[PDB]
Ligand binder design. Structure first.
Ligand SMILES: Cc1cc2nc3c(=O)[nH]c(=O)nc-3n(C[C@H](O)[C@H](O)[C@H](O)COP(=O)(O)O)c2cc1C
Ligand SMILES: Cc1cc2nc3c(=O)[nH]c(=O)nc-3n(C[C@H](O)[C@H](O)[C@H](O)COP(=O)(O)O)c2cc1C
Ligand SMILES: Cc1cc(CCc2c(C(=O)O)[nH]c(=O)[nH]c2=O)ccc1F
Ligand SMILES: Cc1cc(CCc2c(C(=O)O)[nH]c(=O)[nH]c2=O)ccc1F
Lengths: 313, 313
């Protein structure tokens, strides 16, 4: 019948939204996502200052997914904060704002300013931990001590419920460690699994060349390549973080894919590459497809099957 | 126009071989590989003692690839050593023997006994590091200190050129660190990139169930899902280990996929999931397809393009 749900003290028309970075950089983009049928929108991960990002071409797509090394091009935090404060129409749907500063200090600075807007307007924070770290070091979410510092500092500075965007993990010990870090922070109320699968390489056979310019062609992977990865991370954190919500992202092109994310434990379902490729019309299609599968199965609510993936014995 | 390679003091009719674990567990399997058109074969990663492996179902394949949590079923080292020593016909093609002990000590014991057979018969060792150590710790190659210990101990015990099978990495810092570890060991003459992408999760929408029984459905991913991950790893180690060979594994279903591996840096090209699905006839197909690409491009040998992927600007 209808897909509306309540999470985080907000009402959503359906569990669909854009993935951070896709269709959400400019005022035009945010107005377009707001006019769509999505249940929510999230803004492009920002830094304190505007960034031009990397040289083009920096994104490419293919039948099985996408590769990107955008370099965090964005209009700067002041712009996104102004959109949240003054421009967004909250009567239409909830807004998430994604932050990805290049240091802990930068993230602290931005969240201290976001906090009163969050209180006043109800904008929700997604903290992207696929962010630069200290020398010789991996991305923050792959450096568990760094991650614990970032969360401690942001929790202290912000003081309100927030969520974190995670990269994929590929080892059960890493799932255990990462989830134990997140579970030290009671203000982390949702975990979004996953960011792109890092540092893939697409090569074109005819030209014998890589397809993106930055980083000698290396970039994050999205789309069909990454659905089983994404489902694994969703379910691993769903199991390990019972007091948190999990938001699913990766490889959603259909309502069946969305269905799989919800069965794994997703509360909201984010759409990146498929949205970039098909445009905002995708949301109507996804909704219709998901309701069709529910109807064939006799499900009337999402809660009937969320996290109810079955195991063998 | 030719596919011949000469490396590691052996001659190879073509670069194609099975990936460890596929079509290589039993004497029947190894005779089948030997009778095929492949340029080489590798035996199933073994332990000191025979293992039954995990309960079934433990492997499943789909249009985009495969998932497995086999649990290292194998006939035990003594069997693979006898095959190398007494049964394999070296006039047909070269043999690699893969080992995957559960501790550094188990690996040391195997390699000590492999050494004279390596020296007399020319069997080539592939050490699988993409493998369990202490439960609750990451797999060996995700624990750089453990990886260093294993390589130091196997190098001392074995005393002959060998290669290593690596899991994929997803962070530049990890590429840098892993390759620096490998480069400490002059006996590591080849690096095979990559083993399966760890701990994915396939779910079947109709049944609402995971598809393999072990590990709550979590398993390693192969096939079309992993090709750009594979290529990235090949090229990353190609660039970082200029005194070693790189063998490519992941996502090969065609001669075009092979060609991309070789452009990235691959010498040998291993075939896992596609072989499991198509059977050994795939090697005639791959050879024909690769040669056709070479003929269209005017390439006469593999060295003309190996590692010659172009970057932008
Ligand atoms: C062009 C592009 C830009 C992105 N920028 C961001 C970003 O600013 N913040 C972020 O959290 N993730 C970003 N991502 C990652 C996506 O949010 C998403 O995690 C990933 O693409 C996987 O989802 P998909 O398979 O639907 O593409 C970006 C992805 C693409 C393709
Ligand atoms: C059924 C199965 C068993 C495997 N067992 C092993 C193994 O014993 N040793 C190992 O190094 N890799 C093992 N692997 C990994 C493959 O060698 C290969 O790295 C991986 O499947 C990716 O290649 P692909 O995309 O061609 O499948 C196995 C893979 C499969 C599908
Ligand atoms: C340069 C760079 C930036 C980021 C953060 C922003 C981001 C980007 C990006 O803007 O490149 N792309 C993603 O797929 N995920 C992201 O989280 C992540 C990795 C990077 F290499
Ligand atoms: C003992 C044991 C070994 C491995 C390594 C063997 C292996 C396997 C396996 O036998 O499950 N599957 C893969 O895709 N790659 C591998 O390297 C993986 C799981 C295990 F429990």
């Amino acid at each position: 019948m209808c897909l509306k749900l309540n999470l985080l003290d907000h009402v959503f028309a359906n569990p669909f939204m854009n993935a951070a970075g896709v269709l959400c950089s400019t005022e035009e983009d945010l107005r377009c996502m707001t006019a769509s049928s999505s249940g929510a929108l999230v803004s492009k991960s920002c830094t304190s200052a505007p960034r031009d990002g990397n040289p083009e071409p920096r994104y490419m797509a293919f039948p099985l997914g996408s590769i990107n090394s955008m370099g965090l091009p964005n209009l700067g935090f002041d712009f996104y904060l102004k959109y949240a404060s003054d421009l967004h129409d909250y009567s239409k749907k909830p807004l998430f704002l994604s932050i990805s500063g290049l240091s802990v200090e930068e993230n602290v600075a931005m969240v201290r300013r976001l906090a009163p807007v969050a209180q006043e307007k109800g904008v929700l924070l997604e903290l992207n931990l696929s962010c630069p770290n200290v020398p010789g070091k991996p991305q923050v979410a792959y450096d568990f001590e760094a991650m614990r510092t970032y969360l401690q500092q942001v929790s202290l500075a912000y003081g309100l419920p927030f969520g974190v965007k995670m990269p994929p993990y590929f080892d059960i010990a890493h799932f255990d460690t990462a989830a134990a870090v997140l579970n030290e922070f009671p203000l982390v109320k949702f975990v979004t699994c996953v960011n792109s699968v890092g540092n893939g390489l697409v090569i074109d056979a005819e030209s014998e060349s890589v397809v993106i310019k930055p980083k000698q062609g290396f970039g994050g992977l999205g789309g069909k390549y990454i659905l089983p990865t994404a489902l694994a991370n969703v379910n691993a954190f769903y199991r390990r973080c019972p007091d948190k919500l999990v938001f699913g992202c990766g490889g959603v092109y259909s309502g069946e894919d969305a269905f799989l994310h919800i069965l794994a434990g997703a509360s909201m379902v984010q759409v990146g590459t498929a949205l970039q490729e098909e445009g905002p019309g995708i949301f109507t299609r996804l909704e219709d497809e998901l309701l069709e599968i529910m109807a064939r199965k006799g499900y009337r609510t999402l809660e009937e099957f969320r996290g109810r993936v079955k195991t063998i014995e």
